[PDB]
Design a protein around this ligand. Structure first.
Ligand SMILES: CC(C)(c1ccc(O)c(Cl)c1)c1ccc(O)c(Cl)c1
Ligand SMILES: CC(C)(c1ccc(O)c(Cl)c1)c1ccc(O)c(Cl)c1
Length: 267
């Protein structure tokens, strides 16, 4: 029941996802790992209290490495996972950038808007991709041979847990990535009218997809719930951006690609 234009729209989105999302994380290599063996700091202490996650490393030979993070005791041990998380966020950013650069609607935009759209949404599309590998039963993000296990009040798990409950299709996840990518009200966007029109289509296609393929009573209002997530994911964008900048101020860790996406000039 989709138009032919809507059908081709989903197929290009699925095609970009197919090409730029390494669901097995096979090419995530050479990453750093935790070492072996004033009112600011008190806020960064509270900030880093969500990164406390254990880390599992299953080798091809069958060996397994597990890391259990320390407990906060007023020192620098609270930064032990920052170098590794930065490498993973960077690998995730490269794939998100590759995702956008394949989409025709994205390439046709001016280069200054392409940069602005990526800067404003890169983190959101990363969270949407992580949710597809999130295991809500074990509280673990199964990233191929890597596993991030947790040691709902903290908004970005409430997001991940709720989004998994809706139990979406691959087509619905990638349509969400497009709506969040093509947000016309990011800082610095100039073709606001052109990007808003594109964003609308993506949203109307997602609405039509749900109504043609999901008649069950459990999926009543499903389109409106997704749009609520995206608004909620945008809020979690920005409150995590703040959190990032605060940790970076006292304890630098952001990679060059991260600095570029978060406006850090390096000076
Ligand atoms: C450094 C890291 C991974 C981080 C830092 C503290 C936290 O509590 C969590 Cl959950 C995650 C991060 C934070 C915000 C971002 O936008 C990006 Cl890309 C990366
Ligand atoms: C999905 C994951 C592993 C994550 C989140 C943001 C990132 O930038 C990276 Cl690299 C990885 C995560 C970790 C701790 C948390 O508290 C939550 Cl909500 C989510």
């Amino acid at each position: 029941g989709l138009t032919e234009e809507q059908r081709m729209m989903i197929r290009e989105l699925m095609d970009a996802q197919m090409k730029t999302f390494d669901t097995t994380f096979s090419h995530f290599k050479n990453f750093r790992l935790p070492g072996v063996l004033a009112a600011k700091w008190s806020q960064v202490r509270k900030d880093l209290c969500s990164l406390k996650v254990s880390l599992q490393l299953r080798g091809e030979d069958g060996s397994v490495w597990n890391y259990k993070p320390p407990a906060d005791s007023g020192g620098k041990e609270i930064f032990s996972l920052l170098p590794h998380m930065a490498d993973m966020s960077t690998y995730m950013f490269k794939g998100i950038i590759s995702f956008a650069k394949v989409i025709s609607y994205f390439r046709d935009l001016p280069i200054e808007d392409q940069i602005s759209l990526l800067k404003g949404a890169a983190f959101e599309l990363c969270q949407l991709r992580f949710n597809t590998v999130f295991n809500a039963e074990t509280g673990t993000w199964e990233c191929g041979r890597l596993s991030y296990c947790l040691e709902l009040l903290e908004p970005m798990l409430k997001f991940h847990y709720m989004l998994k409950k809706l139990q979406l299709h691959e087509e619905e996840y990638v349509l969400m990535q497009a709506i969040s990518l093509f947000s016309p009200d990011r800082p610095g966007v100039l073709q606001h009218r052109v990007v808003d029109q594109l964003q609308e289509q993506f949203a109307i296609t997602l609405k039509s997809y749900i109504e043609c393929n999901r008649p069950q009573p459990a999926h009543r209002f499903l389109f409106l719930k997704i749009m609520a997530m995206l608004t909620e994911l945008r809020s979690i964008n920005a409150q995590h951006t703040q959190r990032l900048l605060r940790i970076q101020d006292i304890h630098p860790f952001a990679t060059p690609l991260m600095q570029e996406l978060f406006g850090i000039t390096g000076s």
